[model samples]
Target: SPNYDKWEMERTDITMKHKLGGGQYGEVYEGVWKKYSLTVAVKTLKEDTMEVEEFLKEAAVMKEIKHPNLVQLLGVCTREPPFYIITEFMTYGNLLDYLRECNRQEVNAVVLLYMATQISSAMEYLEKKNFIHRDLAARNCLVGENHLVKVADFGLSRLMTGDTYTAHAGAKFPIKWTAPESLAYNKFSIKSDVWAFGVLLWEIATYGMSPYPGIDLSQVYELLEKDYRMERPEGCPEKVYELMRACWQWNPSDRPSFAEIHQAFETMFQESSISDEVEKELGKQGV
Candidate 1:
């Protein structure tokens, strides 16, 4: 009855090379697409993750959404169970680990800003599509060579049927990165995602340091209700910190849209002499 056959791939055409990572739901593999002769990242769903029919419906939605800064969904193997969702391989892995691997001095502000801009651009695209990235964090984004970053990990993403979607009661979510309303009421919208982006920017500023350091997860909601926010990381620019604060606004309507956020980052990226510095640095790396 479903017409997702256009995005389907033959299981035999894919060769799983090695396991990339996995938890209770599924495993990700670095694999090869024999038909295209391309490296691919394959996400294999475990039993009971979701019905095969529901999974294909999600894949169908993914097939239509393409952006340079969004991890591209190559195809799907949904003819049977143990279904595979194939996507473009991001060589550098998750952005959180990539930032952590680089020493603080090795990555300049401009480079970090560039990565953030790419992410915002991708979010802008999704925002326009009425899609909600319920979970957004540095760990959920993937990086590629030459400082390329893309929004990945769509496990919790959903097509927004209305202005907001409330999760089922007691759904686990990232506390420190979550917005106050989301933490308290289980409401998710683009504005909540904007809140997560603020925390993500802090992660980049601190070179992947965990948010709310030394604060227990249980206390985060109470602290947020009291207007507590993380202090700016040392050496982070004041303007960038202001943007982070803007995104952390308590009221969803008070936060800027992804389009506005992307524009602000673009302006900052273009106006700074740091852009030239990044150019020199990139030259040194021969990228």
Candidate 2:
């Protein structure tokens, strides 16, 4: 048993009404705060695998990180047994669901530009603050209306401000998006995250297709340690695919910054701009 009010917000106890998302650690629920009477998401961490106290402490620390691209952490449920993190409810859900709908007509390109921008913005901030989001995947990114993108899930996030170790427990980090160095020796650097952003770029382009369709969980292990990353899809455009390939390079030092990435996409978008002449035909033909 744990205390009901650890870091109680306005002295209200939150009761979970329904589960929104569930995973290995715990679940997120839709709840109504007694005093506020507003919709909120309550993220509960399992008490066994990790410390509930630590989860609350981290949520408290993460709440201070406010950025346009990162999901804002409003308040927290500091109760025992398991703690709940109160924050903005992303009604549209994860990037996976949204991509499924956008893949058909190449509608994801617009969203992809925005998503890449936000990811870069968030990554640059984390780098300056000396932190690394070890797990940067589409599933961890939440989507909103008008294609607004917000990165979520901070349990695996690590502080690089001081003597931050690269990475540990490789299984915890997403192998699909894992950077080369991060795969080998469990190393995570801003460069590593850059690698992930590249793979993310591919997924964004393909509307959420897997990095390597035939590859499995451990498929890229050796290549990752060699500072290796992923390759672009077969039908991917040359310029876009080449740039994406650059991101997954074997050398972490060779990886580009989020700023460079933002600029590169600016070019890709400009070059790939379609004409109303071509567009009108597609629309007229009911494409």
Candidate 3:
């Protein structure tokens, strides 16, 4: 159909320079778009990974949505085999690797909080659009200049057709980041995505450490059922951990919306900025 026609880019226009990373289905590359002289990340899809029809349907949806905190889908090459999905280049790559590579002193608490706010802002946009990022995690988020973080990896995302989506049997999902209902019932909704955000916040707080360390994936649901939660990461603020707890509430209805979460992080960011400024002024005054 013509739904995705507007976003079609000629295959020749993109120069795939080097490989970035990949999985079983596809590989991502750091490339350049000749038309706009823009650096881009090109995701090359293997034919067996997904059907062309399905890819177009999702591409059409992505074309309609645009947010600064969400990765911008520039164009796609879908006329033939080995489809390519082009998106804006993120200088720092994924947030997970970026966090792990940096020292704690280099990326302070305020900076971590700011990253959380950016991701929440992106999720809030999707929430408003009735879209669910089935997989929302630090590894799926990309970082650019000036601490700019954008949500990426929409491979499992879906636009809600109803209040929730029931997954097909054997569908793959991240167990550690999944909500109790999702893990038990195979039902996914925006609320479930919010649960994943809580895990993501933990990732940010811990500088990309794996969640539930030393616990097997098989034990996560049982542990969660027992009302167990990760302890606050060392040096993480009490308020941020409180927010994470609010996000992990057992009942989906009890969890705060992305808007509420974003507002809370924004408040923290602003307060931290003000205090930092005051401290600078006091230091200048020799007090």
Candidate 4:
């Protein structure tokens, strides 16, 4: 698609070191591209995989997008049944694991705020481009240098028709992180994504705690129907909690846009007298 010759590399050029993780359709590997002397995460589909077109679809979506907060699509290899999508290796891995590590407790609130801001910026870009990340969560984000987080794993992303994605009934979803309207009626929009982003912010504030803890999956809908939202994790800022509340609004239209979320984060950093080093981390995002 779109003559992506420049972004293609030979399968032989890759030296698969080890698998990073397995997904429904493929496994991700930590590998090296010998020609470029580059470390990259190689996502490969297995033989007889379902949704092959969806696997290949990401290449076209990622190739045109470039931003520091968004993971860069390095290259692709589609010469065979099993295909590969190469991307910059994230040294720190996904946000959930990186944050839960005992050694990473040093990632203070300031750092978390910075990470959230970065994701907000990336989502702002997606909103402008009229795309929706149907599965926006901590598990989908990668942590790079100095706890820098980037919005990644576009398997569930889509270019929306006008501004909404009508969901298919019975499609699997992460119940805890999905918006009420999406979960109930399968109607997805930027606002539904906004609801998910608020959950993501909760994840960051809690250092990777699962959302809606102690609530059974079957009961999540019932509870949310009663307007029961999770409490702010211990030590999470009141202002940030308030922002989360705004995102959890029952009506999608009441939720704040990503642009507003980014601006709110910008204000938080200013109010916190954020460290110069932390400021520079975001500057690298080129926003």
Candidate 5:
């Protein structure tokens, strides 16, 4: 690979045998570290048209914070066949693939609790660090073998000072997942993220139902502007739906903090399990 910078990495060294994964920035390759096998996703920056700032931006954002759900940076190799950002790989891959293909509402209460908790944990952690994950899309999320949810793709992410962040000119996001404020004004904030969370909850509740209504982004925007917030799919807990609506409030200030939501969710999940245990115990005792 003499022109490595200008092309994708295709190394099959004894120490680095990269399996082709996604084909976006570059192909993800599986590698090893200190005798423990690991997955390393190498996204080669476009040599012909890639800006240096873009590459540095990705590295800058990722280097700051570390979370279990967020990808862990191993190291960097800029002088190779292709520049790479080595990260801890999730065996199950991105969250989009892990979700059930058929849209069946999750029957097990525990499953919803788990997903909500995992996302909330990630959000809460980010908020605690005074940062907002600008692009909180499902495809950018990775689910480990243990079903831990981690947010990825910090290239678009920036540290926030508890203020609204701006998106690039003509920038757009998926209609099914982005918040209304984000679409209308290119403004994203902690509250905007909460709105995205509502959509995420809807996605999880339906076991991956594509957000309904016409798929057009303009139509999606119109529908959303006209109070067409996503409906809680069948069997979604009423309490959770209520919380989702609150998160989707138009006013960013109206949205609850991730910390608040995390506390509530933790309490609810704990109580639900504990109450079930008590019920089982009472049944065994018999009146």
Candidate 6:
């Protein structure tokens, strides 16, 4: 576990470089810390708009968690005007963009499966923590060197005390990724996250293509209510497609847990182990 008391950083220690991007509340900057010679991504929130409770909650929650597949929160800078939430900088950035680049280069299925397995492993960890990742998507995952994948955006998740969360009015959600119960009644649970994970699997298999191709935003609920789900993407294996279908079950309780998903991928990895023949095939295909 991380020492929450030791998680504070002085603003002067950081030398901000180019802008990495922006999130719901703050802008992110890629920077280097002069004191530790560490490269970090700093998310800064203006004091005027920052909620102290929200900031503290996010920081405290992140501090206690340590997992290989989860993004690490290095420190925070709340002493100054703009509060900073520092995390390890992911070299390749968001998984969505990385998958797109891989798709463009025609990477093999084995490589994609490896990335998907990492995500499943992370979700399994979250399950053990009794938390729901409310927003599990390709865009919320980060990719690093040596094909490393880590789940990001834990700032948006909360530990579950009950079976479900009733979302507040006007809270933005990814319509296509939401479970039917969540979309209809604002109920969110780990099962709902399982639904989103299926969509993430589709995103990975399809190389970042948007879910429910050609469907309008207004029609998503209607179509889902009619039991219309996305067909398997081309070149996607039948087993992976079955996993996605399992996640889309109408009843939340019917969906498989993240632990099951993780085990499934583990089996797939063993069966499709990387070998000289596979490497030769990949070479022939220019991957």
- What is the per-residue lDDT of model 4 for residues 1-287, given as tens digits with 9 covering 90 to 100? 64445888787888889777764425888888898888899988876666566667667668767788887888897766678889999888888777787253468776777788888888888778866676788878999776679997455455467255554443224778877777677767777778888888988888888989877889998887677777877767888888888888887766777777777888987766555646444311100
> Which predicted model would earn the best lDDT?
4
Model 2 has an lDDT value of: 0.63
lDDT of 1: 0.74
What local lDDT does model 5 show for residue 79?
63
Better of 3 and 6 by TM-score: 3
Per-candidate clashes come to: 0, 1, 0, 0, 1, 0
**Tens digit of lDDT per residue, candidate 5, span 18-64?**
56464553445667654445456555554543444445455555667
Which stretches of model 6 miss by more than 4 angstroms?
1-4, 22-26, 47-57, 103-106, 154-156, 166-172, 274-287
Screening candidate 6 with a backbone cut-off below 3 angstroms (N, C-alpha, C), the clashing residue pairs are none
lDDT of 6 by residue, 79-128 (tens): 66676789898987888878877644545676677778988888777677
Runs of candidate 2 with Cα error greater than 4 angstroms are: 1-15, 23-25, 46-61, 101-103, 156-165, 168-171, 223-228, 234-237, 267-287
Model 4's C-alpha root-mean-square deviation from the true structure amounts to: 4.8
List per-prediction Cα lDDT, in the order shown.
Answer: 0.74, 0.63, 0.75, 0.75, 0.62, 0.73
Q: Which pairs of residues collide in candidate 1?
A: none
| Candidates in descending lDDT order | 4, 3, 1, 6, 2, 5
Task: List the candidate numbers ranked by TM-score, top first.
Answer: 3, 4, 6, 1, 5, 2
Pairs of residues clashing in candidate 3: none
Could you estimate the TM-score for every candidate? 0.86, 0.78, 0.87, 0.87, 0.78, 0.86
Query: What is the Cα-based TM-score of model 2?
Result: 0.78
